[PDB]
Amino acid sequence: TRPTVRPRNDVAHKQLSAFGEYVAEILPKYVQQVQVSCFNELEVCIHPDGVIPVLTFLRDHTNAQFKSLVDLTAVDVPTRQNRFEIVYNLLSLRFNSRIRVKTYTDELTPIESAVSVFKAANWYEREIWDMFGVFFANHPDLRRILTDYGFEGHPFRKDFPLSGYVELRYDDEVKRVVAEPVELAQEFRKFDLNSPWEAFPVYRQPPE
Amino acid sequence: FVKPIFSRDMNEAKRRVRELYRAWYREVPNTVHQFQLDITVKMGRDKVREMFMKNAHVTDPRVVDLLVIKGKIELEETIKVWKQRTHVMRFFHETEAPRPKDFLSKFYVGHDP
Amino acid sequence: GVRVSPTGEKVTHTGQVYDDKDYRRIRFVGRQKEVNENFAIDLIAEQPVSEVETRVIACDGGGGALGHPKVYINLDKETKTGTCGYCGLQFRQHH
Amino acid sequence: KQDMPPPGGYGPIDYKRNLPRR
Amino acid sequence: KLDITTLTGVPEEHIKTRKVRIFVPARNNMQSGVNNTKKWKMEFDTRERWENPLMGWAS
Amino acid sequence: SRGEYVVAKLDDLVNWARRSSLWPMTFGLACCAVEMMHMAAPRYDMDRFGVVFRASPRQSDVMIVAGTLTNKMAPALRKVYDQMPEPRYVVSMGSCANGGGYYHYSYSVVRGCDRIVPVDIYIPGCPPTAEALLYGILQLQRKIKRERRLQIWYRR
Amino acid sequence: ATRLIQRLRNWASGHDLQGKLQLRYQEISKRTQPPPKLPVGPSHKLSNNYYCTRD
Amino acid sequence: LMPHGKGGRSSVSGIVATVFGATGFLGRYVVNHLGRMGSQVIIPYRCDKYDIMHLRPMGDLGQLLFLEWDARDKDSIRRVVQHSNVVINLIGRDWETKNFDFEDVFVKIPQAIAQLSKEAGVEKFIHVSHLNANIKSSSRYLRNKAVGEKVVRDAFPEAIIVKPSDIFGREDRFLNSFASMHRFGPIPLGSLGWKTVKQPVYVVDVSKGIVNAVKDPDANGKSFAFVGPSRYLLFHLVKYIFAVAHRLFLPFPLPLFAYRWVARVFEISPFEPWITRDKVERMHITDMKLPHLPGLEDLGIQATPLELKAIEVLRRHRTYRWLSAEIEDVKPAKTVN
Amino acid sequence: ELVQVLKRGLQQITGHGGLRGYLRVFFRTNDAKVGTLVGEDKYGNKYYEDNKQFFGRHRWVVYTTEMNGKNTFWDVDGSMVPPEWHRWLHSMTDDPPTTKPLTARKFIWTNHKFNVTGTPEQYVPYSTTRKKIQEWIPPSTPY
Amino acid sequence: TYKYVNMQDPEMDMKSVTDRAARTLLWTELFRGLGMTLSYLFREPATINYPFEKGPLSPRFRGEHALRRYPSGEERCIACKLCEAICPAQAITIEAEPRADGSRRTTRYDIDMTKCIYCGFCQEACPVDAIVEGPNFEFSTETHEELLYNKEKLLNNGDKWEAEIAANIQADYLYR
Amino acid sequence: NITLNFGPQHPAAHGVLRLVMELSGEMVRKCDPHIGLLHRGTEKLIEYKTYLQALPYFDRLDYVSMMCNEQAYSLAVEKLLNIRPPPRAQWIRVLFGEITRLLNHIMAVTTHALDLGAMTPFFWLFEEREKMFEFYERVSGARMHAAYIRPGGVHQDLPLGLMDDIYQFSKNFSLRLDELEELLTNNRIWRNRTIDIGVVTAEEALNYGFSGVMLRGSGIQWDLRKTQPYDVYDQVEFDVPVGSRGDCYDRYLCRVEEMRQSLRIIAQCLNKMPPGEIKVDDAKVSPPKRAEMKTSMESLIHHFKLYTEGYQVPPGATYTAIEAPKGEFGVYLVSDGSSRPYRCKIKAPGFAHLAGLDKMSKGHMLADVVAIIGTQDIVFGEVDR
Ligand SMILES: NC(=O)C1=CN([C@@H]2O[C@H](COP(=O)(O)OP(=O)(O)OC[C@H]3O[C@@H](n4cnc5c(N)ncnc54)[C@H](OP(=O)(O)O)[C@@H]3O)[C@@H](O)[C@H]2O)C=CC1
Ligand code: SF4
Ligand code: SF4
Ligand code: SF4
DSSP: OOSSBOOOOHHHHHHHHHHHHHHHHHOTTTOOOEEEOTTSOEEEEOOGGGHHHHHHHHHSOSSOOOOSOOBOOOOBOSSSSSOBOOEEEEEETTTTEEEEEEOOBOTTOOBOOTTTTTSGGGHHHHHHHHTTOOOBSSOSOOOOSSSOSSOOOOTTSSOSOTTOSEEEEEETTTTEEEEEEOOOSSOOOOOOOOOSSOSOTTSOOOOO | OOOOSSOOSHHHHHHHHHHHHHHHHTTHHHHHHHTTOOSOHHHHHHHHHHHTTTTTTOOOHHHHHHHHHHHHHHHHHHHTTOSOHHHHHTTTOTTSOOOOOOHHHHHHHOSOO | OOOBOTTSSBOOSSOOOOOTTOGGGGGGTTSOOOOOSOOHHHHHHHSOOEEOSSSOEEEOOSSTTSSSOOEEEOOOOTTSOOOOSSSOOOEEOOO | OOBOOOOOOOOOOOOSOOOOOO | OOOOTTTSOOOHHHHHHOOEEEEOOOOOSSSOOOTTTSSOEEEEOOOOOOBOTTTTOBO | OOHHHHHHHHHHHHHHHHHTOOOOBOOOOSTTHHHHHHHSSTTTOGGGGTOOOBOSTTTOOSEEOOSOOBTTTHHHHHHHHHHSOSSOOEEOOHHHHHHSGGGOSSSSBOSOGGGTSOOOBBOOOSSOOHHHHHHHHHHHHHHHHTOOHHHHHHTO | OOHHHHHHHHHHHTSOSTTSOSSOOSOSOOSSOOOOBOOOOTTOOSSOOOHHHHO | OOOBSSSSSSSBOOOEEEOTTTTSHHHHHHHHHHHHTTOEEEEEEOSOTGGGGGGGGGSOGGGEEEEEOOSSOSHHHHHHTTTOSEEOOOOOOTTOOSSSOHHHHTTHHHHHHHHHHHHHTOSEEEEEOOSSOSOOSSOHHHHHHHHHHHHHHHHSTTOEEEOOOSOBOTTOHHHHHHHHHHHHOSEEEETOSTTOBOOOOBHHHHHHHHHHHHHOSSOSSOOOOOOOSOOOBHHHHHHHHHHHHTOOOOEEEEOHHHHHHHHHHHTSOSSOOSOOHHHHHHHHSOOOOOOSSOOGGGTTOOOOOGGGTHHHHHTTTSOHHHHSOOSGGGOOOOOOO | OHHHHHHHHHHHHHTSSTTHHHHHHHHHSSOOOOOOSOOOOTTSOBOOBOSSSOTTSSBOOBOOSOGGGOOOSSSOOTTOSOHHHHHHHTTSOSSOTTTSOOOOOTTSOSSOOOOOSSSSOOOOOOOOSOOSSOOOOOOOSOO | OEEEOSOOOOOOOHHHHHHHHHHHHHOTHHHHHHHHHHHHHHSOOOOOOTTTSOOOOOTTOOOSEEEOBOTTSOBOOOOOOSHHHHOTTOOOBOOEEEOTTOOEEESOOEEETTTOOOOOHHHHHOTTOOEEEOSOOOOOBSSGGGGEEEHHHHHHHHHHSHHHHHHHHHHHGGGO | OEEEOOOSSSTTTTTTOEEEEEESSSBOSEEEEEOOSSOOOHHHHHHTSOTTTTTHHHHTTSSSOOHHHHHHHHHHHHHHHTBOOOHHHHHHHHHHHHHHHHHHHHHHHHHHHHHTTOOHHHHHHHHHHHHHHHHHHHHHSSSSSOOOEETTEESSOOOTTHHHHHHHHTTSHHHHHHHHHTTTTTOHHHHHHHTTOSOOOHHHHHHHTOOTHHHHTTTOOOOSSTTSOOSGGGTSOOOEEEOSSOOHHHHHHHHHHHHHHHHHHHHHHHHOOOOSOSBOSOTTTSOOOHHHHTTOHHHHHHHHHHTTTOOOOOSEEEEEEEEETTEEEEEEEEEOSSSSEEEEEOOOHHHHHHHHHHHHHTTSBHHHHHHHHHHTTOOHHHHOO
């Protein structure tokens, strides 16, 4: 229960918890869950219409100066209609604390841009615009990062093939590089390594 | 129901597209000369008319305005003399073989759907 | 002494040589098709069959942790040799 | 014969720089 | 009908040519585990894959 | 001392002239590159061979590609290949540039570098040991040495 | 490696170089070494090893 | 074998071409078109490995093959054509190589290729002459084609006889030479160009047409004669060539024999001439207007006008003052019809 | 001092190649060391040994000529070395194979053909594992 | 735990001052620093004399693949097809089929060095220790095709190097 | 003004950037850093792979330091599996984490010198980086992209030969840094090129999330070791550089100090490695020795499983920062509990720096800009991905 096991830090869990109810007090209007795992990792909801007003508050001291948007990590789950799950990782430097505060959005919901508030999201912007289509409040430019020029796709939508539909090559008489239909050789020979028989009864969503 | 991107109802959106067409329609020769396209310029304007036709089934103003957002964003890369001649030619797919919509030929080709 | 194809090129140890009709054979022209001289097949039965008066045995492929996992070959039937599932080499119980 | 390589001794090293005026 | 047919980057050809398959995946006959019958999944219909003239690969 | 023979020895002069002093251009796109530096680090040192890291796509002749070749980057590489004067050569390097490498399946990489420029020798490796690279270049020199444009012209 | 050249070299050096050999000579280490045997591992005891605790 | 996959570089087709003349101008194009379809293509070559290196992109791994061979030997030709199902032929040389007399280029070699193709059981041996092939005292090379046309017509009787006229492309000898005259300065022409007329044929069309010709069972002994969209008179044609080259244009008459002498002065070089006594008459010859022979659209491929193709071919010659200039503004050359 | 070094030079002049041989071995291997000790030179590729030289340079080889009944010096390269000695130059093993000759099993190659990308010998990848569907046999009988 | 860099304040003392101005003029230290580069001229150069000399390599070193045999001369491969399940780039392709003798045997083992990342997983993963990441490293080719190895070429590679490979394994095997 | 694309082609561009400038006479106005010329898109490529398969990807992002990347993965995977490694593995991870740090800082130093045209240190020190690649080769069989650090810990035990030569290796190295001490550190030209260039106020740094020496140069003291001694750093002695001016000269001297600092640490890690497994006891995560798998059944069974479907993380999506020498490093896992990740974003420390460069660009002449890329230790591989 020790040589392999990583010890559970109850203390920080206690402090983060208590601060968690503290914040739960402070912004009832958007804050929801106050998740607190044994990893010492706190988490909190925000409604997307509540993106900016919460985040600004975060930067300003209460007992945690949530300075430096370290990340706007993003996840797409097709099942939920609110398929997008934008996440604000954060770190109050003065208090050496860390927190994860996320949201959700639909394909045509103009979620608020923290560009005015953090500016670090001038690109967390355009990536998460481009890879997805998560339209953003008001940004100086929504021009694509990463993906090419005429490129139409939105990879990381967890949709359409990992190769994509596009596969460019130089061509002769046109004297120029041209995009072409894929035609993969050998093909990504995907292995379904999923295991029937649950190893974790403690979890397990009920059949209901 | 859900809150709109920009335009609400088609006319707030329809206003934006025309702004887009001219934004291309004037820009085209500039592109014809910056990249020295061998295409006759009317072909360019025709393609300009065509890409505005592929989006004919659009009916939600959020879809229209999001399409002109992305289309103006493409215009950004165009006007700033970004891209390359090849990228301009990607719209043409001229290297690719023509597709026979006729079913009989589709029979003759391969297994297909 | 690999069996020779009608085209004259040697067949693979997994026999599969191309048809005389086959255009693909053109690839080998100006070049050399390569096939291994040492078929493992002949070398399987080339070896003398080991025999032990006992009963159940344990082959390891020679070399502790330098070969196949330890394996217990049965010799219930003297009518046949006990070929390894790994080494491929036979065993028997002489008496 | 159990073994592996734990340290055999290891003498002093100087991370400190010297820049003589000479 | 909130179509995102254009909002997606997919070629029109792949949206015209085929229907997809919504279903709930079957349990292994060869195995006891019921565990994958749970959770729905959708998969596109398979197409022809000619062999690679070289090396005999899938193409 | 006859007619054809002089053309042969004369050809030897030019192919020797070129193989004896390649000027590969710096262009590494990934961690293949930090082997390439070690090809030119003193322990190995490519320079004895007369070869040198020139800049620019013109004074340089052979184009040693290195590292991953994404969608976006590729046309630039094409153009650069066009940029260099004859007799340009290219040396593929790294499993990625060999044909998309580790990443061969992605919308990202452009698979085989040979899809863009007519690569002349491939160097397997992820990344190749710098010495393997050096050996690949020795192969490029032997490859030039066996080339004989002048002799063909005489009998053309 | 001549000594006068060593003197003049260390002279310009401001440092002994012979005191910290730069080029790696004879000492190195032997390539061919006697077998490792390796640590036995803490939980290879047979008396108890129920997964309920080590997990 | 038979086709599989969507028609592209990785999809297969049963084609097994042996394109002689791949080293030259047209050959890289026809190889590009066979290769684009994913058909495998043999490429026999004699010039050197380096010369065709640029073709390597055109194929996909196994799709291309390279084979050295002597024209002088027959057996090599036998080896290269063995697995061929189709055998396209493009060997030629306008200026006539010294060591290999022009006669062989359109006589002995095409014939050996034809017989061996017959022994090979080639599904479709194919040969490419020209619209100006009917025997003429002018242009021995043009005269020689007629003999090759017949010998090929006999040794392999069901051979197609392609007759393309003045194909123009980026590397075309015919279009470029006219563009190259600015370096010359003055612009001689045999009694100007008013007496003669031409109907030049675009090359990508000729190539794709060769492909679709391979694809058509119906063609066999058919003597195809490719023709351009438009039948421009030669003088107004040069007018257009510099009209797009934007170079200074100073035409003048010159006697055909007198021009022939200067061409003879230029034939002295082992180095390849820009001008030759073949080229003289091969220019001065008019293009025959033939209706009865099969149409270009029989292959389903539309004719592409030179005006839609010229500026890309000639931008390299136009001066920087003009090198970046709009296309529409040159105004098209006058048509005889 | 310096006279000692000049003596080193004369000593490596006369310590190998005598006169006309030294110029040749020097224009072949640009190194000019005394041929200290000797290797097993199976194909004439002598594997000279020494230690005073700094690490990495203490083992070396002179390849001689026509390996595998083909080619020549002025075309020397890698892959010319045999696999045992190939282990020896890389100093994976302090001990030259001389002292510890390897297993010499029946199926391993003996001449060692080295790399051959050009020339008629040339690897060809190809389809393996025969056929698939076996297309139906046409009747030979009329009617 | 932190340390300031620099920050230190120079002396105003006149000796030290005139010394610094003497650096400002007569450059002094440049030459001192300059002198240092001279020290390199007198050191022995570090180049290995490739290819007549070659760089040191550990026995572990990863390189060209090779299938290898039993001491008996049977191939070690049993087509367990887990090495196919591990190759992170999935270069490997295997069709296991029965032997006429009945043993499991690959009919078309193959791997392309174009997609191999030489992580050398498969050297570890194989239960029968079939495939081995051999010593050889120098094998650049004129063409792409020569990279896409059949089982055949790999077997040949196991033929040329088996003495060597088995030797290195003889050196290494305890660690695994 | 004059619009101008720059790299990749410039040696200064490191084959990656295309930061177009709309230059005036030579003073910059517009100066946008385009990226996605290297974007390998590994985020989806991580998703379809067993967690043991993900491991190479991190050698593939930080080209130079390598072991630290993999350690950045082993920490983040062992968290969800709650697994605590045998100590020897951690002493190793620190040992080669620091030797990777030496390689990384030697890289940044000598290349930054190359853009300043110094030439020589390059050749004076790669002679050393081969000396270290000889070591990763001695422990991994690969000169670089060694996979030797693993989620269970480590592939394999250290060969007996190292423990001496490595000491020998660092017996002399301090002098080799002395040779630089006699160059740029004191040299006149060098100060002018870098003094008072790209100075950054503490707040912009805290806004953009600058980290590492890039904070420590401008005086912010934020650190990922002493604040969170996630491994043996808690036992290790060392001391952290902090800059004053925010001068590149400052950041420089810091990196030189960290190099000294690893000279301090690696001494102690050589001084303190326990005997013990370098792997977890569990065969349900850490695979059996070849000697045991080939007799005992269960060892071979789980062997067969980890090499085919692998260990299964309990379901969860998480994020972990890493003390990369270049800054905070991003490990954003999203795991459904299947060995396949559901998603995995990777924040590169250099991403924020490049986001911040244009703020430092405008109002500076082009040489200032060339100075700036070398200011920030940016290997572009990690940044677009
Ligand atoms: N506009 C036009 O050019 C027209 C052309 N044609 C005819 O069609 C054919 C195709 O024209 P095009 O491809 O432009 O001409 P090219 O000269 O470009 O093609 C001929 C190629 O065949 C090679 N070749 C032929 N015979 C030999 C030989 N005996 N030894 C060595 N090499 C040989 C040539 O040299 P190598 O391969 O050795 O480099 C060259 O590469 C020509 O034969 C021409 O008469 C007809 C109408 C119009
Ligand atoms: S080749 Fe393999 S190693 Fe070299 S860069 Fe591309 S991926 Fe990284
Ligand atoms: S190594 Fe031999 S046995 Fe192990 S998987 Fe690859 S092929 Fe099957
Ligand atoms: S070498 Fe590395 S990558 Fe290639 S197969 Fe063996 S393990 Fe997979």
